[PDB]
């Protein structure tokens with residue numbers, strides 16, 4: 001149907017916007033602490049602590065499959081990256097501190113992303 005095509009165009013547009021947002025957010029992680037999944041070989045007990053692991057590579061996989069239907073779903077995954085890290089790692093660690101900085105700097109980006117999604121009507 002034409003309606004289905006239009007819906008798919010909207011999703012493709014959202015995906016383009018979220019790709020830009022994801023690039024901007026990952027730039028706020030210059031240490032690449034959040035670039036890849038926590039290794040279950042190097043941290044074998046990780047899943048005892050963290051029930052829903054997340055990282056930028058995994059987000060990017062879902063993104064390119066057009067797997068984010070709206071900004072909320074994307075933000076959920078970004079918050080998992082931050083929140084998982086701030087639970088597993090103590091306050092005095094380079095990991096926890098990196099998550100705080102990513103959260104703070106990323107908030108700015110996500111604030112305008114929300115305005116843009118609403119403005120252009122992408123969801």
Ligand SMILES: Nc1n[nH]cc1-c1ccc(Br)cc1
Nearest residue numbers: 033038043084085088089095
């Ligand atoms: N990036 C993370 N999110 N949750 C835990 C971690 C982590 C834990 C140990 C090391 Br070593 C590195 C990273």
